[PDB]
């Protein structure tokens, strides 16, 4: 009856995750006037993103920038780099300026080799990828100003060598306690729910 | 009855740890107008953290800055570096200045390889991470001045190469004796409580 257990876990996830949230894609555009003799850009990656509502008043939300990096040798030697977010008004005025410093998680060369060996099947079939997801937490608790709503955000990374695939500006209501495991640790939720439902069945 | 033993250990932890404490996260922002052509920042990590209570009168408190470092080759070769904390008033006046010298715990290359091999599963699955937690103890018996409260702290690290993930400014009641094992050695408390409750059960 593991089929019924899987269906019950799926229904559990669907019911307890009606996430009222928005995932704005971030498109970094560069400058390209240099000689390009080295693997370094010209100017810092910048991006205007428009949210056009979700950012209403009273409810708190957590503004983050989920950032997808490759575990390339250029990224491990890059080191610390600064991420800046500037929410803007309708007329261009800045609402709230933030700043964070984010850096790639360090794993030893032997650890990388062992990861490549053991997770080889998922990497070969395209399920897994040798990438890092950094959740730059731009705002631990956001509350919108009543008079001037947030039209969008300008996001900047102050690194001329930061190899990356893409970026998301996820905004989600701060309600976490009931969904904390599902909001942060999905695989454990799947394991626990499937086991509990199978034992019940 | 290991189920009941685990439940009893959890109840033990909940009852004996009603930690009246705050964990203000520190957000280090840099200056990035320099060349930045090498793996080194331009200026020292500095950060303002606000606390707006908890810092009340009479009870002694322990102010520490739990600092999270990677065991990267850039951090092992770094050596000693200075940490400065300055509590400020509402008007900007400094309450109490403190300074410490903190350095990453040294482990030999053979020890690092052995750790990577034996703790490989926890590092692969995401449980463990090759990181150091330095408990820079800024204040051992903090007691608040009666007339002027502590609005917040400005924290600085005087290293242009210190690779780090984040930082917390944890303040907690100095009462340790009964909770000493749970205060400093949380892992052993699990074994002790589980074994004691299982033997009792």
């Amino acid at each position: 009856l593991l089929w019924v257990s899987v269906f019950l876990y799926g229904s559990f996830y669907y019911s307890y995750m009606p996430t009222v949230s928005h995932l704005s894609p971030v498109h970094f555009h560069y400058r390209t006037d240099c000689d390009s003799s080295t693997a370094s850009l010209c100017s810092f990656p910048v991006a205007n993103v428009s949210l056009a509502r979700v950012l209403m008043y009273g409810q708190p939300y957590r503004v983050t920038l989920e950032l997808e990096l490759p575990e390339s040798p250029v990224n491990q030697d890059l080191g610390m780099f600064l991420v800046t977010v500037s929410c803007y008004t309708r007329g261009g005025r800045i609402i709230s300026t933030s700043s964070r410093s984010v850096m790639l998680h360090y794993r030893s060369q032997l650890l990388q080799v062992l990861d490549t060996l053991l997770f080889s099947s998922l990497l070969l079939f395209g399920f897994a990828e040798q990438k890092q997801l950094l959740e730059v937490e731009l705002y631990s608790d956001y509350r919108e100003n009543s008079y001037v709503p947030t039209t969008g955000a300008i996001i900047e990374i102050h690194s001329k060598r930061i190899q990356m695939y893409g970026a998301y500006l996820r905004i989600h209501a701060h309600f976490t306690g009931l969904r904390y495991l599902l909001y942060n640790f999905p695989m454990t939720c799947a394991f626990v729910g499937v086991a509990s439902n199978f034992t019940f069945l | 009855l290991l189920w009941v033993s685990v439940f009893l250990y959890g109840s033990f932890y909940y009852s004996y740890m009603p930690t009246v404490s705050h964990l203000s996260p520190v957000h280090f922002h840099y200056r990035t107008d320099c060349d930045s052509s090498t793996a080194s920042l331009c200026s020292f990590p500095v950060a303002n953290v606000s606390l707006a209570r908890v810092l009340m009168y009479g009870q002694p408190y322990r102010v520490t800055l739990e600092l999270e470092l990677p065991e990267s080759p850039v951090n092992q070769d770094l050596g000693m570096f200075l940490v400065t904390v300055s509590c400020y008033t509402r008007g900007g006046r400094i309450i109490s200045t403190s300074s410490r010298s903190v350095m990453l715990h040294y482990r030999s290359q053979l020890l690092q390889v052995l750790d990577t091999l034996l703790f490989s599963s926890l590092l692969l699955f995401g449980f463990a991470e090759q990181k150091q937690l330095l408990e820079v103890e800024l204040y051992s018996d903090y007691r608040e001045n009666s007339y002027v409260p502590t609005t917040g702290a400005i924290i600085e690290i005087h290293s242009k190469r210190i690779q780090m993930y984040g930082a917390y400014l944890r303040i907690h009641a100095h009462f340790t004796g009964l909770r000493y094992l749970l205060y400093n050695f949380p892992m052993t408390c699990a074994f002790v409580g589980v074994a004691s409750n299982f033997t009792f059960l």
Binding site: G177, Y180, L181, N184, F185, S196 | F7, G10, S11
Partner: peptide, 21 residues
Amino acid sequence: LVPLVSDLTLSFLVFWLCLPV
């Protein structure tokens, strides 16, 4: 993010669901 920081209270009941389930 450590796996046991704010879910101990949930662990007092979700794990306790081992009784009815």
